[PDB]
Amino acid sequence: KVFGRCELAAAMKRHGLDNYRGYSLGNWVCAAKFESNFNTQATNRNTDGSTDYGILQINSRWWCNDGRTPGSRNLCNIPCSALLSSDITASVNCAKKIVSDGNGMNAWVAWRNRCKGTDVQAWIRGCRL
């Protein structure tokens, strides 16, 4: 599924991400935009052999099991495929754990390099939330 901007904002809010660990909803929407262009089915292989999955490009190195990332963990206790669902529950639950891990949203390299410090409220501008 390819979410629209306000549609995703709404889904994130419904799943409790709005202001989670102090990160406004625009921050989450901006991260999703640059990680996956709002496409739940996005997958991208990393040079180390891990893969990033889903709207928020969650890495198999630590967070999910894809069966092909040696030495990796699965700290969200989920198959990485669950992160590709049209329903964002699994992605959201796992992102909650990620953003709680110590470095906040810096875990998302695209958020640090493209969202951090910017006018992230633009992402939810005009949305009925």
Domains and their CATH numbers in the chain = 1-129 (1.10.530.10)
Q: Would the annotation count 101 as a binding residue? A: yes
- Is residue 63 within 8 Å of 90, Cβ to Cβ? no
- Is residue 50 within 8 Å of 39, Cβ to Cβ? no
Q: Known catalytic residues?
A: 35, 52
Q: Could you give the C-alpha distances from 17 to 34, 42, 47, in angstroms and in order?
A: 17, 20, 30
Best CA proximity match to 86, nearest among 29, 38, 24: 38
- Is residue 60 within 8 Å of 78, Cβ to Cβ? no
